Amino acid sequence: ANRTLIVTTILEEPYVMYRKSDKPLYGNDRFEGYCLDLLKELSNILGFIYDVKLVPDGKYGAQNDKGEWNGMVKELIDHRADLAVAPLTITYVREKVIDFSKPFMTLGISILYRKGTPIDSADDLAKQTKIEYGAVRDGSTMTFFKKSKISTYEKMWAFMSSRQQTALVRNSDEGIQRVLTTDYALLMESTSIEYVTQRNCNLTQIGGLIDSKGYGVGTPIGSPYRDKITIAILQLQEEGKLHMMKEKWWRGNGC
Ligand SMILES: CN[C@H]1[C@H]2O[C@@](C[C@H](N)C(=O)O)(C(=O)O)C[C@H]2OC[C@H]1O
């Protein structure tokens, strides 16, 4: 029997969650969600077995000032995982050090905030300071602002970087709690926003998509699996299964 593939991933609802059960759950059975369903479908098309591991440091992957990567990106670089199957955003900087399949889901950065305010866009956030705003620290969303050369986004980065102790948050759930408990707007991927707004009728996406990208399966550079995974994703798309999986996890279940 050929080798079990090691898959790195990260807890992020709905994509990867701990399954709830009365019975004890072991190994891969402990996890459920969109990415686990995807991984199952991929393994069925491509004929591999796998072992799901969380990224040890609990991070997506960013570069430090020395250029060193961490998170799921580093696990792939260092060949401690064969695949990353997660809501891992395909970015030019990451493409330099790891390979990605074609996307299995598209998204754009946008804004999560409450309904019923005069805030209609990023520009409306940028031109004021009363409403705090920010992003999950050290992910592709935060990095977008850090690296932007667009006036509005530079101003927003200046704001959230100078006010970093309160404006930048640890993870999605912490950001959502800030939106819920304080006057705060979270810069967040549209996929996640949709999940939230389906579950809290006081919350809304503000404005449109600030960028346009995708999540892809990551592999170490040069992996022969990357193209096979692309082909499998294309098949799932052709079969309508990617649409089915999104519907399943975003609007029923639940919740
Ligand atoms: C999967 N989406 C969520 C998560 O995506 C991240 C990580 C990003 N998907 C990445 O691959 O670095 C982001 O930066 O938007 C961190 C966290 O932020 C809130 C929301 O966008």
- Measured CA to CA in angstroms, residue 82 lies from 47, 63, 180, 222 at distances of 15, 21, 38, 11
114 and 59, same domain (yes or no)? no
Measured in whole angstroms, the distance separating CA 121 from the mean position of its chain's CA atoms is 22
Distance CA 6, CA 225 (A): 12
- Amino acid 156 reads M
Do 204 and 197 form a contact (C-beta atoms < 8 A)?
yes
166 and 230 belong to one structural domain: no
Contact 144, 60 (CB under 8 A): no
Cα-Cα-Cα-Cα torsion 32, 35, 37, 43, nearest 10 degrees, comes to -120
For residues 52, 55, 56 and 60, what is the CA-based torsion angle, rounded to 10 degrees?
A: -170
Q: How was this structure determined?
A: X-ray
Domain residues for 70?
Answer: 1-107+213-255
**Is there a single domain that holds both residue 98 and residue 166?**
no
Question: Which of 172, 193, 213, 249 best tests ligand 1's pocket when mutated (most atoms within 8 Å of CB)?
Answer: 172
One domain, residues 94 and 115: no
Q: Is 188 in the pocket of ligand 1 (CB under 6 A)?
A: yes
Q: Are residues 99 and 129 in the same domain?
A: no
Instruction: Examine the domain organization and report whether 127 and 200 are in the same domain.
Output: yes
- CB of 179 within 6 A of ligand 1: the answer is no
Closest CA to 185 of 109, 241, 236: 109
Do residues 103 and 4 share a domain? yes
Q: Are 10 and 86 in contact (CB under 8 A)?
A: yes
Answer yes or no: do 207 and 218 share one domain.
no
Only one residue has tokens 């667009």, namely 150
Cα distance between residue 174 and residue 188, in whole Å: 12
Q: In what order do the strands lie in the sheet with 184-189?
A: 132-135, 184-189, 109-114, 203-206
The angle at the Cα of 153, spanning 194 to 88, to the nearest 5 degrees, equals 45
CA of 179 to the centre of ligand 1 (A): 16
Q: At what angle do helices 225-238 and 34-46 cross, to 10 degrees?
A: 110
Binding site members for L-glutamate: 87, 89, 94, 140-141, 189
Pick from 117, 71, 107: nearest CA to 195: 107
Ligand 1 close to Cβ of residue 220 (< 6 A): no
Total number of domains constituting the chain: 2
User: 161 with 200, same domain?
Assistant: yes
Containing 220, the helix (H) or strand (E) segment is strand 218-220
Q: 88 with 216: CB under 8 angstroms?
A: yes
Q: Does the beta carbon of 41 sit less than 6 angstroms from any atom of ligand 1?
A: no
d(CA 7, CA 49): 10
- Ligand 1, residues 11, 15, 178, 192: which to mutate, most atoms within 8 A of Cβ? 192
- Regarding whether 56 and 175 lie in a shared domain, the answer is no
Q: How far apart are CA 244 and CA 236, in angstroms?
A: 10
Task: Determine the Cα–Cα distance for residues 71 and 77; give it in Å rounded to an integer.
Answer: 10
186 lines ligand 1 (CB under 6 A): no
Distance separating alpha carbons of residues 231 and 133, to the nearest angstrom:
39
Q: Are residues 144 and 245 in the same domain?
A: no
Cα dihedral 31, 236, 71, 90, rounded to 10, equals -150
Query: Are 10 and 99 in the same domain?
Result: yes
What CATH number has the domain bearing residue 128? 3.40.190.10
Q: What is the DSSP letter of 110?
A: E
DSSP codes, 160-214: HHHTHHHHSBSSHHHHHHHHHHSSEEEEEEHHHHHHHHTT-TTEEEESS-SS-EE
Please tell me the distance from the alpha carbon of residue 231 to that of residue 96, in angstroms, as a whole number: 22
Output the CA torsion 110→128→181→188 (10° steps): 10
